Design a protein around this nucleic acid. Structure first.
Lengths: 180, 112, 53, 83, 61, 203, 49
RNA sequence: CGAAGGGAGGCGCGGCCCUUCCAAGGCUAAAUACGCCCCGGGACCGAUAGCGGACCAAGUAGCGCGAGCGAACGGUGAAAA
RNA sequence: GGCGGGCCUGAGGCGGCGGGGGCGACGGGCGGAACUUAAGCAUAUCAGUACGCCCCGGAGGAGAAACCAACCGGGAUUCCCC
């Protein structure tokens, strides 16, 4: 029944999750292990679908032989420049990045520059928005005049749910085996 | 060995008949006080010396002038001696874009 | 030349001269031995060319 | 002696050669995220009370250079004033 | 053999990955080498500077 | 401009957050094998500094080296002969453990060419280094003018000839000028050029 | 020996087949003047293998 | 244990200058070396010499469990007449 | 809770292409002696040698200064003369 010696890889990945729930995760790392709410995540994702670049099939008929629609920018290197230049109005970062050191400093540089940010769940979901397998971060820089009321609604709930001050002091860290 | 290298220089000379085998190289003061009052061929003309004859580094290399970015002039007198070198070479050089066959290839160090 | 073989002195008690001998007992590795090295082998390090002013 | 003796040195004119903010900004964001190393926190405690020779001595051992330790003593001092 | 090898060579001629018996002779070293098109490939910037500063013929008097 | 921040985040290695991240990795790495294929660099900024480009024919492998000094392989600990040449424990390796990590992945995979390696993590027992290796027979690599030199035959198993950065440090080739004038073509070659007897014709 | 392996037997067979003297016509054709085959063996005196 | 402007200037340390360079990533021709093998030359050796081995069958015959050791033997005459 | 997808980490198979082993030199990386010299012998010398192992190539390695210097200064490497 549940007494199987699972393959070594399965055991290590189950144990890595258990250790991260027992060790005291520092506040900066904990902010990635406490993402934004699912209801909000759907709402930003729905708006990002209304933007997005050309789809792989649309790029295929564009790449047979044949405009400035506003699209969400992707990739940490472009996103950082947009946050630094204050061009970004929303930055979405994924909870899971294999080297977390790739995105650990982003919440800090977004707060300093005033760009609102949210840590969304799954980089695979952020890839679906840009039509790529996975991306560390997506970011809205403009927004359609038609979709600016929704943008305002989302940007307000991002502020209600995201607290850089509390997350930089949470130190949530580890739970006790008995606490299941 | 003398024969092998003479053949190699003759083969290289045949490959570029009008052009001389060696590039114009600068006159530099031999180092240390033991040799300060004596000058010897160096590696390349400095960018400051090239500016005096109004040639870019890439252009100077095309007209067979060795160019050394690392070398810095050190003395005003050095720039003047070296700028004069380039002027005498620019008069001597005859850039060609059967007259080539009657051109006489220069042998040995250009300007000794 | 003469040193390509394996020869060792047989020793001091076998009624034989102490020169180096091959496995069979054959004289080897000496100027006086057939097949032995030259005592002072000739060499290309001799100055073949002299100098004149 | 590392020069030759020529009283009349200078019979030639000498061409004498003349001599980022974002880098500071990056450090400010990474400092906010990482904070100070444990060794620097101890020099910040000593600079609050036990004073310079103790702080310099710890820093020369930890860093390994006097110029580098003296510079760390100056850098950590700004945060130590407000302890 | 010559006829079967000739007809077979022809059948796989103009096919990607032709049989090893029908492949050129060469040596292991030559068959693993870089084509002189691949070896003389220069980055765009370096190639631009070759065109910018073309090789010339000159005579020094 | 993101890669600037990572260089500075990684200068704070004893930081509270890096310390957790490096403890979690040094645990995971211990659980795996000594030479492991990694689907991507764990250190993207340092890999890109040492050459890795995310194109086909660029592979990263993590090698685990054991930390410590060397013990000469002499039976029973006895190294007979002159007393200077005695002493078997506490001897120190002449090559860094970074160089050993690159020599170890060369032997495991002799079909790939090694470009460079970087420190990933350490524990008291082991130190892990990730090595960037190139497939010199892939179409993209052969036709890419930037990495096309790895495909040259003279770069075959470069780690075995001390030609990687770590091997070059161990051969004294990072130093130049006074201090390095008897280790320039090679340590062995310099001795041979200095101890040669010229014996010219018109001596 | 009465129990041998084919591999051992085959090398022994070649030794028997080639333990032959120079053919008399070959001595004439080649004008040898050196009739003995010096590779010839005798079971009693020689140790093959 | 661990930096930030740092390195070097052939006596360590602390200060102040000066001169000179940019480490901890990568590429590169030429001149340079050299056996097997082919070519040519020699104040070289001349069959106990010269390679161990000039000889139709030499690393051969032979020897040693094995690693390995390792010979000797040139010439009729102009023509086999 | 159980059923699909995405991502991420693995697992087996199939295709295409590569690796392996050889050469008494030259070349690069390592491990590494002792006889010997010191009229003895420990540091030293032999010798950064013999040998063992690994790795190329027609050459290899080195190479465009975190260089040398102290000058009325030179200017990547390799090689020769001293």
């Amino acid at each position: 029944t549940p007494f199987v010696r699972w393959p070594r890889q399965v055991r290590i990945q189950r144990q890595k999750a258990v250790l991260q729930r027992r060790l005291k995760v520092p506040p900066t790392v904990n902010q990635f292990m406490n993402p934004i709410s699912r209801n909000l995540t759907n709402e930003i994702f729905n708006l990002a679908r209304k933007y997005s670049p050309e789809s792989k099939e649309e790029h295929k008929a564009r790449l047979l032989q044949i405009s400035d629609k506003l699209v969400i920018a992707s990739g940490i290197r472009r996103i950082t420049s947009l946050v630094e230049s204050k061009r970004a109005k929303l930055v979405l970062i994924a909870n899971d990045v294999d080297p977390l050191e790739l995105v650990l400093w982003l919440p800090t540089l977004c707060h300093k520059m005033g760009v609102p940010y949210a840590i969304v769940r799954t980089k695979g979901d952020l890839g679906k928005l840009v039509h790529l397998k996975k991306t560390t971060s997506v970011c809205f820089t403009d927004v359609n005049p038609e979709d600016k009321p929704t943008f305002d609604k989302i940007l307000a709930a991002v502020a209600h749910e995201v607290d850089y001050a509390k997350a930089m002091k949470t130190y949530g860290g580890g739970v006790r085996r008995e606490d299941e | 060995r003398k024969i092998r290298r003479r053949q190699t220089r003759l083969q290289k000379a045949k490959a570029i008949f009008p052009c001389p085998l060696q590039k114009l190289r600068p006159s530099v003061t031999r180092c240390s006080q033991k040799f300060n009052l004596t000058q010897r061929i160096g590696r390349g003309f400095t960018l400051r010396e090239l500016q005096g004859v109004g040639l870019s580094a890439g252009k100077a290399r095309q007209i067979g002038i060795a160019v050394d970015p690392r070398r810095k002039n050190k003395s005003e007198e050095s720039v003047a001696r070296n700028v004069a070198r380039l002027k005498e070479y620019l008069s001597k050089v005859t850039i060609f874009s059967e007259e080539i066959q009657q051109a006489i290839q220069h042998q040995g160090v250009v300007m000794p | 030349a003469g040193v390509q073989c394996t020869a060792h002195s047989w020793g001091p008690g076998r009624a034989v001269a102490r020169l180096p001998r091959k496995h069979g007992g054959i004289g080897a590795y000496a100027n006086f031995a057939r097949g032995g090295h030259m005592a002072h082998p000739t060499t290309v390090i001799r100055r073949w060319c002299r100098k004149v002013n | 002696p590392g020069k030759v003796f020529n009283l009349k040195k200078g019979g030639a004119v000498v061409r004498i050669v003349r001599k980022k903010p974002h880098q500071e900004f990056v450090k400010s964001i990474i400092q906010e995220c990482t904070g100070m190393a444990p060794y620097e926190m101890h020099i910040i405690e000593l600079l609050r009370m036990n004073k310079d020779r103790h702080a310099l001595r710890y820093a020369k051992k930890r860093l390994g250079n006097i110029k580098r330790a003296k510079a760390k003593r100056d850098q950590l001092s700004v945060y130590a004033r407000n302890i | 053999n010559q006829k079967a090898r000739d007809e077979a060579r022809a059948a796989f001629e103009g096919a990607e990955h032709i049989p090893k018996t029908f492949r050129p002779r060469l040596t292991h070293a030559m068959r693993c080498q870089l084509t002189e098109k691949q070896k003389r490939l220069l980055p765009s910037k370096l190639m631009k500077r070759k065109l910018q500063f073309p090789k010339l013929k000159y005579a020094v008097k | 401009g993101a890669y600037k921040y990572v260089q500075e985040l990684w200068r704070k290695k004893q930081s509270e957050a890096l310390h957790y991240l490096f403890r979690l990795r040094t645990w995971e790495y211990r659980q795996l094998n000594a030479i492991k294929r990694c689907s991507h660099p764990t250190r993207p900024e340092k890999a890109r500094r040492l050459g890795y480009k995310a194109k086909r024919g660029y592979v990263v492998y993590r090698v685990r080296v054991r930390r410590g000094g060397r013990k000469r392989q002499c039976v029973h600990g006895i190294s007979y002969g002159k007393p200077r040449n005695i002493g078997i424990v506490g001897l120190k390796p002449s090559r860094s453990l970074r160089a050993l990590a690159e020599q170890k992945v060369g032997r495991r995979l002799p079909s790939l060419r090694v470009l460079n390696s970087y420190w990933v993590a350490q524990d008291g027992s082991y130190k892990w280094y990730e090595v960037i290796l190139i497939d010199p027979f892939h179409p993209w690599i052969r036709n890419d003018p930037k990495i096309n030199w790895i495909c040259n035959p003279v770069m075959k198993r470069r780690e075995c000839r001390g030609l990687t950065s770590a091997g070059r440090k161990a051969r004294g080739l990072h130093n130049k000028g006074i201090g390095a004038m008897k280790l320039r073509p090679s340590k062995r070659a310099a001795w041979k050029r200095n101890h040669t007897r010229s014996l010219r014709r018109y001596r | 020996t009465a129990n041998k392996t084919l591999s051992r037997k085959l090398r022994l067979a070649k030794k028997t087949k080639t333990n032959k003297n120079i053919p008399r016509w070959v001595i004439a054709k080649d004008h040898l003047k050196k009739t003995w085959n010096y590779k010839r063996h005798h079971w009693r005196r020689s140790h093959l293998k």
